[PDB]
Amino acid sequence: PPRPSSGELWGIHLMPPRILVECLLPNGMIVTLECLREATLITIKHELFKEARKYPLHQLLQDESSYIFVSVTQEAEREEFFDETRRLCDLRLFQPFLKVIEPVGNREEKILNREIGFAIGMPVCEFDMVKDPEVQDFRRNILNVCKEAVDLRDLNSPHSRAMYVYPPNVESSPELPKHIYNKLDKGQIIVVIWVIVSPNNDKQKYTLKINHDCVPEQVIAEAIRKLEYQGKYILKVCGCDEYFLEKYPLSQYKYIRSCIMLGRMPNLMLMAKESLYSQLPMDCFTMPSYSRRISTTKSLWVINSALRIKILCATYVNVNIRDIDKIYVRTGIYHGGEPLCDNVNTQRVPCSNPRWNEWLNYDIYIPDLPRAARLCLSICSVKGRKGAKEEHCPLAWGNINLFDYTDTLVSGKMALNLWPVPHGLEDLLNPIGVTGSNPNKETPCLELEFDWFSSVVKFPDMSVIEEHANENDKEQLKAISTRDPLSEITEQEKDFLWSHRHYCVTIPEILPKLLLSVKWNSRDEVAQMYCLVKDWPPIKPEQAMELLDCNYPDPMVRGFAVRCLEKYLTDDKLSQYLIQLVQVLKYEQYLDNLLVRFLLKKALTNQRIGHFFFWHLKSEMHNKTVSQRFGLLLESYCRACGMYLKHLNRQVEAMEKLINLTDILKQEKKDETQKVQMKFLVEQMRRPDFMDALQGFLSPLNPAHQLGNLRLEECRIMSSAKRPLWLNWENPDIMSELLFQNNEIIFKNGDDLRQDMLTLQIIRIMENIWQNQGLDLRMLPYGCLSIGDCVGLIEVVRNSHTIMQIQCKFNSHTLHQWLKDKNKGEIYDAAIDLFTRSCAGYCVATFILGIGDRHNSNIMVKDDGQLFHIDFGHFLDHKKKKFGYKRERVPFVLTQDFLIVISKGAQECTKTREFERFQEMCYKAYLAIRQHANLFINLFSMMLGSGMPELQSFDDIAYIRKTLALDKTEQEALEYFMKQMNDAHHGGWTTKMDWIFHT
Template identity: 40%
Template sequence: MPPGKYGTQEEWEQDGDQEIFMDFLLPTGIFLKFPVSRNDTIRNIKKMVWKNASREALFCGLRDPDLYVFTCINQTAEREELEEESRRISDVRPFMCVLRLVAREGDRGEKLTNTQISLLIGKGLHEFEAQKNHEVDEFRTKMRTFCEEKSLERQNLPWQRWMEYSFPCELEPCSSPAAGGSSKSKHGKKLFVNVKFESSDESFMLQQDSQDLPVALMKSALKKKATVFRSVRQEPEDYTLQVNGRWEFIYGQHPLGQFKYIFSCLRNGQNPQLTMVHHCTISKYQEDQGRVCSQMYKTRSLSRPPPLPLKKQNTSSLWSINEPFYIHLLQGSRVNADEGMKDCPIAWVNTMLFDYKDQLKTGEFLLSMWPSVPDDKSDLLNPMGTVQRNPNVDSAAGLLIRFPNIRPHPLYYPPLDKTIEPEMNGNTVFPSKDEYLKLKEIMDNKNYTEFFEDEKELLWKLRAEVRDYFPECLSKLLLITKWNKREDVAQMVGLLKSWPELPAIHALELLDYSFPDPAVRSFTIRCLKKLSDDELLQYLIQLVQVLKYESYLDCDLTTFLLERALSNRRIGHFLFWHLKSEIHVASVSLRFGLILEAYCRGNIHHIKLLSKQNEALGKMKALSDIVKTGSQKMTVDDLKLCIRQESYLEALSDLLSPLNPSVILFEICTDKCRFMDSKMKPLWLMYKNPLEQADMVGIIFKNGDDLRQDMLTLQMIRLMENLWKKEGLDLRMIPYGCLSTGNKTGLIEVVKSSDTIANIQRNSSNSAATAAFNKDALLNWLKSKNPGDKLDQAIEEFTLSCAGYCVATYVLGIGDRHNDNIMIRETGQLFHIDFGHFLGNFKRKLGINRERVPFILTYDFVHVIQQGRTNNSEKFERFREYCERAYKILCRNGTLFVNLFAMMKAAGLPELSSSKDIQYLKDSLALGKSEDEALKNFKVKFNEALRESWKTKVNWMMHSLAKDNRP
């Protein structure tokens, strides 16, 4: 077989154990060519090279094999050193079947570690070095020192503490004996764990203690933003192009001043003519394949924005001098001159006025712009966007800015203590009774974030009262602070120094992009340090997302997450996968890659475990691609044959589950594996569990769907379950595991001994048209699975779980609720799956809303709850009480859910991209209303769901018919 035959992943994965001919270039100048198995490891191939080279000339010129390393050209056309000799050649997948043997240089251990980290995070460390960025270099140095110190501390832990780190305990939430539903347990409660070693049993005691539980110049908070617009139209022969440039100085979401400029070009036939419109002189124009390329040089003196809150007033002239300004547009569109123009954003970019050293920027900066359109059309800027440049410089519009050097020495942002020292908080203000009542009214309204001018003045006047009596409302005070007024900024930052620490439910809100001030973010992290490990895991998804709002690589949030991840391997496991799953996103690839590198250097031993999981996921992706894109129709038997190959069996067995590192996926049970018949052909993989011979562990690998929305929904359901349990209400929820592991890839936990309502109904009926209306199907199925006395317990499980999911799906606005994504376990627990639509985004067909009920509560559900007796109203009223009690608990914690969803805006989910998308959640949780008002509204929704349930049955019937008619 000729060299280079294997170039694509599909070619490498489909040929089984077939031999391939490889070319080997030796440092002695000798050329070798012989066949190797695609499943051979690099180590075995090296042994074969030495054996074959021993029969060739100049063999005596070769030294010890360990002094050499193979290199190849990889799939990204880069030279790669194959230091990891346990890798198979099929996993290396060289672009051409050529390996070159070269002498090792440098520290082999360091190079091996670097190779392992690069392979694991999916990003070469040489990319960081190629940045030639001082901020990147200093961050890597600082984080490496920090993480290696943490690693050394961990090595010196006593064995009990080391066990706690390596195998953190998972405790079920339970109701607290403390008043008011506090989540804190009694101090001093101890947990006894029996640890079994190879040759003996030994017990040790773990103690579970629940107590573990701008300032001048705007510093890093101030961003300079630009958005460019274009007019969109079919390309005519004659056209006028007008491009508007808009600049705005923004603190968080607060505009501090803006100015605009316009330029246009007129084309008649083949002769473009350039016209200055306002403040801009266009000096160059060229056209290339329908893309407009204009360049503008030396603007006139720009309109002066409002003065910035500078420490020294004379520096405010910075923005009134003649600034050379350059813009290079690579995107544009044309429109007929007589039909007018309509603004449509084409590119944006954000940058900081101060660098990571707190020094005011000077000189020229070429900013590669982002082509994506901001989601909030009411504001054509993108204040929550990244401050990183677009790395795709070849295809991006470039914006060249020159910051003039206004003084001979660098201008630094003043230290915090010097900023607030002369500006404490003035004289004490004693509010009148009316003022205090008005203040209390504002503070009590949880859904109140827009204020009238008189309310803003009152809040600012009584800011000390807010600190002393309403500290959890800090965000409201920050929102009305005048960040373009130096005195107010100094007073707010000074007030923060004496602000009491907030519970996590309120502190999390302050990590939103609306609060970029470093003093605010430092205060927030100080509050979050009180979180227990279990609580931190509960909010980890959001904490990773808000990293995108940080202005600089080195920030308190990054250090906090790394410190906790290096102190608890479970936190480290999920931090790794949450970061790794978005490493492909250009705007965060650099930041997330650097954090992943730092974590790996601080936990070298975890690299091996994570690499095994990464290798298994790679094989799952390869299997999925073969199933989805194979030249011939793939059968389940073909899939099983692929899995039985040695390389697949080895990669897919004996690893920790990415879904839950406490679960070991021992031996894959090939005969039980299959792929499902849905559009993306998910893989259904089953594993033997040697700890329980009759039990098995199952995972579903999905390739082609973004699982982050499912992951978020299940996180919220898990949080609801925890809140209910702390109040003594166990609604038997099943928030199964779900983890996004990459670009539209991820894993879902298989819930064993369960089936969909659709299957149960179809198996109990003669036709799909009548199946949805068979109210006895569910009860009869439960009777068949739970004979005798077990039936009552199964119905109780069904009643509790049905109540929980009725409330959860209503609050979260879960859509697309057909009978194929509602399931029941044989033990009676009902649960929902597949959360592709939420926050009230219900499915429509032909402009008609297919889902017309607040949540799913059909008469066959009621039939099971009432144990098959129509007059059993006592059981149904108890079910209604469960629903109402569960809803009231969620309403009391409504702010937490709103804050967590708000933090996920950075994720870029289609149905959660702006504050408007969260309005559904605020309405369903009745924020701003009393508990009685909220409960009254829920009762109306409950009755509506019951009364209109026949519409759900019709929708289910249509779904079943459509599925049966599918080719």
């Protein structure tokens, strides 16, 4: 199983400096050897074989070099230690013992399987054990994706190898927004090209004035001038591992686009193609042993009977017999989150005797069962003690697919281990939850019985399914297609949409609404919908993503969505929405599907995608609902990612050391002072095992950032209760002085960072919409990555302080005076403008999202005036359950301190031309998000099964429908936003004209 902790032994976080190790010799002798904690296995083996001469039967011992050590790890695995350079403290030993054996079996395969097991947090040998044929079929069949990707990487070597490892970090379009193009001097960019001249590695500066749309080769051509040369070189960003290897306009590269925007000087480095081409290892994939092993009918439409399922008994329930009256089994037949017929309950039985032996009859004809049909069930309790009032509560839930991965309808007897009810879920059924039995068998087990039809029942083939077997309305269809995914759809509209299903093809983006109009409990309507899906024109990827959420479970519908992504989703947008795409994998009925194949292919053909794909899957390996699926997926990724596996193992081991160090501070050393904790911190960090693991690896926040040597004098335990570690590394890039010299990251062990990760992603998407519309509202979506169960990394924003830090260094003018002192003379206006623009972005984003209340400690300001928010924690209607009030809060109220800055110290702050301009930025920002409401609703909808407590149902998403006033007109929505700002600030918010909203 996965490691209980990150400690050096079971029940011991750190080994003492010297430790007794029990060594089991192959002659049956036991030798106790005192070893140094950091000693390598080669040292220990040499020390052991010298000592073994002083023991009986020594003559039976072959040469020292003929053996390796084996031991039990904290994962309960018998691990063979082929790499004898490893230290005793890094072996993850369960107990301090080592057994001496002769190496047997496939050495190469065992070494790779260990490296994969380490990356994923679980031994790969656990998969070989699994009896489920769906699991063994996935392991074998996914290898075609692995093979396809690896060949495509070596196809045009070494360029295709360079494009894999260092893909172009580019925007989705070369088109420049007005305010960005106008920052250029007649469509021309001033760029600085640096050259490392050998043999003394001197830096030469070349200032080039070229067109913005100049392709990288053209930039090189000009550097020569200030024939043979043009084609022998490559461009790299100074200070990081980002390369310009593809023929894109220079301005389309995010670094350049960002440089134009910020009015910053782009600092590039020119180097020879071969200097990079040589450093790229030729990646090799090898077919695993399990791909070379000897493994281990009627149609549904001819079955003339209604659906029925027998509920036998449950092993037990955990209820207080004096508090609950009865228990029963609630069941339902679902297609997504939509029941296909009414829910059916068993009879109520005593708490102490969970036995039903009841056939439940469903209002559905067996041939009418759609392909993605699921049985959603739970054991519920009933308390009927006040009047005729009853309180029904779920005890445990479970979901099953009525058809398996081979299209076989469930039959005979089935035992299902039920799952605990998620925190906050009050619904009796959990249809959004995963399918299958709980791997933990020490849970209530519900015995079921499905019907037998004297044979194996199979879902009809596609050929059989394509049986055919049979002016103002244009404006109405255009209106329905523009509505948000969670807007109300009437039965009249459903009938209207189904009637015009063949004309719907002319407006392809109407498909999600048309699919919700279909009667999924009718094989006649579904067969017709299937024929339309097959020939349906492709929709935009941002629209296709909706068809991957928990509301669209149909494999043909999901198949269509994947094909739109394969054809139109750019690597930029895939990286942007990767968090959502990994999450919707949890909604997939089966392990093998088109979405998992598409994502794995992309992760194995672009290392930027691969890096975050690995960490998003790895971060959830602790969660038993997805552990097997994500483990199998990660195995296939690690088997084919090439050399990147070694870089990922370095990140994994550096993270494990940090988890262990913080566990010590939070557990054993919890009652010690900051001073005593800091002494232990510096001493432990200076050990060779720690220095080796925490230096010279890639940043998990950004793999283009190299983490060199630690600056230990800058490393510290923060004053917060969870004991966050502030860490500082040197940037080892030869031209680090041009980007940043210090890479600072906060490591936090204790808080769930998933909600903050999602908020920071949403902020980044909002900022991009704003920029692409001519609105320069600078946000600061700092890096945040969850790496496990309530463990993650936060990117430090340097030269920034909280409002409280500024105030403690006061009156309402302190903040403005502080900004004046930091931005003197001619740079003052730029600071006020940046504060104003950043304020407007944060004002709008926080109001739309309903994030946690702002105060002086969760608002930060950079020296240059850039304002930003930290520690989001909460979002949406997080105060509804707690206080029951029906309101849309304004978390970021612009107090006098903020108004004084915006108005440059004016007496009447709201009456200024500065405040009028600020209001206009807010109004435009708000309407820009409202116009893109579908994307945000879809992004939140794709996160419903993530397990975040504040994002559990479509009703939680309803909050954004209110803040964006989606049921109102654009004019009413703006009046609504102004009213919210006026109510929160006690007046001050104005506009131009009430009746038509024209200046």
